[PDB]
Amino acid sequence: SSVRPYLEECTRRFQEMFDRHVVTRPTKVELTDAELREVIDDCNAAVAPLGKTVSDERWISYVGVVLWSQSPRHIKDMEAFKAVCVLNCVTFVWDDMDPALHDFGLFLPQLRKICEKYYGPEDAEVAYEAARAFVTSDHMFRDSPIKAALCTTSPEQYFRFRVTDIGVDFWMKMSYPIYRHPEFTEHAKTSLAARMTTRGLTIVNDFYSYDREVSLGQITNCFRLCDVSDETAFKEFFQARLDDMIEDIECIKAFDQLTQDVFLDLIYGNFVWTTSNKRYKTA
Amino acid sequence: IGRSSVRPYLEECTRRFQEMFDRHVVTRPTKVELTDAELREVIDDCNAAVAPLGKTVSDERWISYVGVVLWSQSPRHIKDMEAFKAVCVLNCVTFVWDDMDPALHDFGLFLPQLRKICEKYYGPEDAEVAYEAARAFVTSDHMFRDSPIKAALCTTSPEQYFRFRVTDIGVDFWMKMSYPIYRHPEFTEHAKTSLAARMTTRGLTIVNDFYSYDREVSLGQITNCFRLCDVSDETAFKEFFQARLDDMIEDIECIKAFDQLTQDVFLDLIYGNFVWTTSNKRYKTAVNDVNSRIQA
Ligand SMILES: [Mg+2]
Ligand SMILES: [Mg+2]
Ligand SMILES: [Mg+2]
Ligand SMILES: [Mg+2]
Numbered sequence: 255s256s257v258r259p260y261l262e263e264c265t266r267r268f269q270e271m272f273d274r275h276v277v278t279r280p281t282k283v284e285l286t287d288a289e290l291r292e293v294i295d296d297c298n299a300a301v302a303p304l305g306k307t308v309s310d311e312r313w314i315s316y317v318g319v320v321l322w323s324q325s326p327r328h329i330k331d332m333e334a335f336k337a338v339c340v341l342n343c344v345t346f347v348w349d350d351m352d353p354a355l356h357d358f359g360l361f362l363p364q365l366r367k368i369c370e371k372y373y374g375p376e377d378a379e380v381a382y383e384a385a386r387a388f389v390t391s392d393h394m395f396r397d398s399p400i401k402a403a404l405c406t407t408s409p410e411q412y413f414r415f416r417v418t419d420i421g422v423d424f425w426m427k428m429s430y431p432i433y434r435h436p437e438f439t440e441h442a443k444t445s446l447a448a449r450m451t452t453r454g455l456t457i458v459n460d461f462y463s464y465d466r467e468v469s470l471g472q473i474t475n476c477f478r479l480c481d482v483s484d485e486t487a488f489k490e491f492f493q494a495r496l497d498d499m500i501e502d503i504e505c506i507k508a509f510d511q512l513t514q515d516v517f518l519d520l521i522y523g524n525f526v527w528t529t530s531n532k533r534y535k536t537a
Numbered sequence: 538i539g540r541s542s543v544r545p546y547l548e549e550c551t552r553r554f555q556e557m558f559d560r561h562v563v564t565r566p567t568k569v570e571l572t573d574a575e576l577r578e579v580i581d582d583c584n585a586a587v588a589p590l591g592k593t594v595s596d597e598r599w600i601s602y603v604g605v606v607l608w609s610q611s612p613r614h615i616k617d618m619e620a621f622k623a624v625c626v627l628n629c630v631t632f633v634w635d636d637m638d639p640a641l642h643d644f645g646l647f648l649p650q651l652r653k654i655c656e657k658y659y660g661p662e663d664a665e666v667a668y669e670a671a672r673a674f675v676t677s678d679h680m681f682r683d684s685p686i687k688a689a690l691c692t693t694s695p696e697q698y699f700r701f702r703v704t705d706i707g708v709d710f711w712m713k714m715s716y717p718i719y720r721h722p723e724f725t726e727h728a729k730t731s732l733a734a735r736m737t738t739r740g741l742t743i744v745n746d747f748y749s750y751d752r753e754v755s756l757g758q759i760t761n762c763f764r765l766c767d768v769s770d771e772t773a774f775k776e777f778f779q780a781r782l783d784d785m786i787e788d789i790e791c792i793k794a795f796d797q798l799t800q801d802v803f804l805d806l807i808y809g810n811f812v813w814t815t816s817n818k819r820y821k822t823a824v825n826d827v828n829s830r831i832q833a
């Protein structure tokens with residue numbers, strides 16, 4: 255239906271949880287003017303062969319998630335940062351497109367081009383494989399009987415699907431070159447990093463994007479597992495999702511300090527971006 | 538505590554497991570038969586791969602390991618016995634790693650042997666996928682041997698524990714080296730996203746944890762979900778065991794929403810592992826000459 259009856263109160267509740275359990279706030283990243291126009295030229299060229307124009311605003315609404323959800327004071331590689339900017343901006347376009355627009359012969363080569371632009375050969379393969387995996391998953395699951403059984407069964411089945419489908423496993427495998435931290439790289443490559451962060455990212459996104467996706471008939475959203483019309487049932491479900499986030503965040507705190515910073519900045523950063531950006535005030 | 542145990546439940550739980558498979562999976566697993574030469578080629582490569590680490594391991598101990606691959610693949614659908622033989626070797630030699638003291642973990646010596654196994658049996662693309670998955674598994678296994686992260690994810694809740702096990706039990710590794718056996722596009726994708734590993738983690742881990750609890754508590758190993766409950770309390774053990782059965786059943790029922798070939802493979806893995814586990818030397822007694830701690 256719509257969660258707007260709950261939008262103000264739940265935002266307060268999220269923020270409360272972050273102030274209390276994470277504390278350390280994210281900060282938005284500054285691109286130099288050379289750096290920015292690299293990113294957007296690269297986005298426009300990637301989508302170009304698919305036939306879709308993309309407004310300047312829209313690229314900017316996409317890129318907000320990367321400007322806000324990395325871990326600035328750890329960043330060691332801005333080419334990898336622009337790689338993630340470009341990969342996550344075009345990832346969004348592919349996500350909004352009707353499947354019959356999804357041309358793999360044309361888009362996959364641009365993904366590889368991007369990865370070979372910004373990464374060394376080992377990382378470029380890792381980033382590209384994960385990009386290929388994300389766009390392919392998104393396509394073969396559109397209105398798929400598997401997606402239906404994973405998103406209507408239980409929260410546990412749903413978040414299991416979202417590890418890949420929300421894009422966090424992709425995120426980690428294209429972001430570890432930014433930090434060159436051996437622990438973070440291995441947890442990225444086992445996908446333990448993605449698994450640790452999946453629920454913090456997905457629960458936030460599902461809440462604020464519930465309106466768009468119900469309007470657009472999309473089922474990949476954990477709040478469809480409850481009756482948002484029932485206010486009691488929503489508030490029980492919301493609290494249970496809140497506890498999911500809290501247990502994840504406490505276990506993340508057992509990771510090494512650099513790794514925990516990236517994980518928590520990712521989760522909190524995505525919350526600040528998701529609320530304040532125009533991508534999720536409308537549809 | 539010291540010698541804590543699930544021996545009192547051994548009998549009823551194997552029956553609860555079996556009747557769960559009879560109701561929900563139905564198809565019985567089918568053990569791959571290896572001709573006598575394949576079994577000797579496998580074991581021949583296994584020795585070579587672990588030899589730089591400096592421990593002899595017996596044919597009896599190799600064959601104990603390889604039983605999981607013989608029993609838990611999907612012979613209805615196998616197309617590539619070279620990839621199958623790869624999985625036998627790789628799974629067998631990483632079992633040794635999992636059974637070793639970390640002081641014996643030499644990546645510089647062992648990783649080359651993994652790469653040679655993969656290049657022997659796979660084409661170019663597959664060799665790289667199988668190797669990254671093998672390396673990630675022996676690396677994760679080494680690096681969590683004492684980790685505070687292991688203790689965090691294994692003592693907080695079943696959800697955190699199974700999240701750790703997707704990698705640690707080795708099922709992501711298994712999927713990413715098994716997909717060339719089948720040349721099935723859907724299954725290949727599910728392997729590469731780890732969706733396949735994630736769907737089968739609980740069914741493999743719950744079965745293995747029950748039957749290896751006694752070995753692991755004695756060795757002081759903490760990666761086992763039944764440590765999250767009071768197995769001495771009969772009432773607490775039963776609620777817990779029941780909840781893990783529900784976990785298995787929910788996974789199996791969602792697995793049936795995958796295409797028919799893919800779910801055949803998923804269910805043969807879960808059910809086959811259960812047939813191997815409950816009919817093999819490794820899970821007959823806690824310490825014996827196929828599961829004993831390999832030492833420095
Ligand atoms: Mg979307
Ligand atoms: Mg989507
Ligand atoms: Mg959404
Ligand atoms: Mg073990």
Ligand SMILES: [Mg+2]
Pocket residue numbers: 635678705706707
């Ligand atoms: Mg293990």
Ligand SMILES: [Mg+2]
Pocket residue numbers: 745746749750753
């Ligand atoms: Mg075990």
